[PDB]
UniProtKB/TrEMBL annotation:
Belongs to the RNA polymerase beta chain family. It is found in: Nucleus. Coiled coil: none annotated. It comes from Sus scrofa. RNA-dependent RNA polymerase that catalyzes the extension of a non-coding RNA (ncRNA) at the 3'-end using the four ribonucleoside triphosphates as substrates. An internal ncRNA sequence near the 3'-end serves as a template in a single-round Pol II-mediated RNA polymerization reaction. May decrease the stability of ncRNAs that repress Pol II-mediated gene transcription. DNA-dependent RNA polymerase catalyzes the transcription of DNA into RNA using the four ribonucleoside triphosphates as substrates. It comes from the Eukaryota. This is DNA-directed RNA polymerase subunit beta.
Length: 49
């Protein structure tokens, strides 16, 4: 849930010509989206943990 309100583009609502310069987000094995700013997402997830 938290990833989807933190602006994670899903797999169905995206064009594959905008996936080269984006980070693959996995959760527990399955690929669930991409993201365009992985450091603010990363330390935000850490300070929520």
């Amino acid at each position: 849930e938290f990833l989807e309100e933190w602006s994670m583009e899903n797999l169905e609502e995206i064009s594959p010509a905008a996936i080269a310069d984006a980070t693959k987000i996995f959760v527990n094995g399955c690929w669930v989206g991409i993201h365009k700013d992985p450091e603010q997402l990363m330390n935000t997830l850490r300070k929520l943990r």
